[PDB]
Each structure stands twice: as C-alpha cells, then as structure tokens.
Write a protein that binds this ligand. Structure first.
Ligand code: HEM
Length: 182
C-alpha cells in the first residue's frame, strides 16, 4: 500500500494542506511553449538525458524541489510529444536538490515528505492524459491537485476513513506513514 514518510515538523498537518502549501510555494516553473529554458526549468533525469529512474526539478525562484522515482520516460519531440510516462513509484518533496546524472542520482538535502509505493503506470499511448504525466507536470506547474487525487485513492483503498484530509499522525496510527526527524 502507499507508504508515507514525513518529518515530525508536519505531524499535525493534513496531507492536503501540506501539499497545497508546498506546491504554492514551489511555484509554477512555466514549462510551457515559448518558456522552456534548458537548465532553468527543464529539470533532469538520472541517468538521462530523457529517461531514467529519477526525474528531479528545483523551483526557478527558490531552493524548493521534488524528485519523482520509478521507471520514467519523456517523449520530448516524439509522438505523443511532451509526455512523461512510465511507472511512478515515489514523489519526494523538500528543498535543496543535490546530485544529477554525473552523481548517479538525485537527493534532497532537506526531504520533508515522501510518498512511496504509488503504483502508478501510464502507457505512452495515453499521452498527456496519463496519470504519471498529470502528477508530475502538475508539480512542475505548482499544482499538486493530481498528486493529491492519486494519494487520496490509495488511502481510501486502505480504508475509506483515510484520505488526504487525514493528518500525518493519523495516517501513522493507521499503518501507512512513518515519521523522520525534524
Ligand atoms: C529533461 C527534461 C525536459 C526537457 C529538456 C523538456 C523540454 C521541453 C521543450 C523543449 C518543450 C517545448 C517548448 C516549446 O514549445 O517552446 C517542452 C514542453 C513541454 N514539456 Fe518538457 N521537457 C522536459 C521534461 C518534461 C517533463 C518531465 C514533463 C512532464 C511531466 C514535460 C512536459 C511538457 C509539456 C506538457 C510541454 C508543453 C507542451 C504543450 O503545451 O504544447 N516536460 N519540454
């Protein structure tokens, strides 16, 4: 089932409130036609250049950053263009991104929260409608709505009383979350 890791700082927050705040602060990197600037708002893959086990992106305006983990593929100019697809197992949120292809991976110097065992798989044919794409492109664009909806479904699948409106501590009591040090 979904497995959540959270710094004790966030023990009393709901998942929805945490994500709404995190993404609003991360802010839209404007990865859109006319506005993509390589090395600024593309993020990167490990091993890359356009596929790998991690995709990571920091904000254009601060150190906030996320890492998507799984078996990921960006089509870039190939049909269906500008689709991220594959298998998405995890999302880690925090700040101070480090690493990259030259390091053999990415890590956050301050990981706040992670969501693992997401079990998302999106075929290339779904294009930009796939859940993997929506989750990650949403985060790139400062919008955690898609991620929230996937977490909500995973939580309900454990028990319908659990949701994105549960606190991290409630989710820990319910067996789906664990705390890390503040
Ligand atoms: C190495 C990382 C990436 C590079 C170098 C890259 C590069 C680009 C470029 C060059 C464009 C076209 C800009 C233009 O039309 O002027 C673009 C657009 C786009 N990319 Fe990426 N991208 C990357 C990662 C991603 C990821 C991970 C996603 C999805 C989660 C994504 C989704 C899109 C979308 C949706 C568009 C806009 C398409 C449209 O509205 O027509 N990209 N990207």
């Amino acid at each position: 089932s979904i497995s959540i890791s959270y710094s004790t700082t966030y023990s009393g927050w709901t998942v929805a409130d945490y994500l709404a705040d995190w993404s609003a602060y991360f802010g839209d990197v404007n990865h859109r036609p006319g506005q993509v600037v390589d090395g600024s708002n593309t993020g990167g893959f490990n091993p890359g250049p356009f596929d790998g086990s991690q995709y990571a992106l920091k904000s254009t305006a601060s150190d906030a950053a996320f890492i998507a983990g799984g078996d990921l593929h960006a089509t870039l100019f190939s049909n269906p263009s500008h689709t991220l697809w594959g298998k998405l197992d995890s999302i880690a949120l925090g700040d101070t991104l480090t690493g990259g292809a030259s390091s053999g991976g990415y890590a956050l110097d301050s990981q706040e929260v992670s969501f693992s065992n997401l079990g998302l798989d999106s075929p290339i044919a779904q294009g930009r409608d796939g859940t993997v794409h929506k989750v990650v492109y949403g985060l790139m664009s400062g919008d955690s709505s898609a991620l929230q909806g996937q977490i909500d479904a995973l939580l309900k699948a454990v028990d319908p009383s659990l949701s994105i409106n549960s606190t991290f501590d409630q989710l820990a009591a319910a067996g789906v979350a664990h705390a890390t040090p503040a």
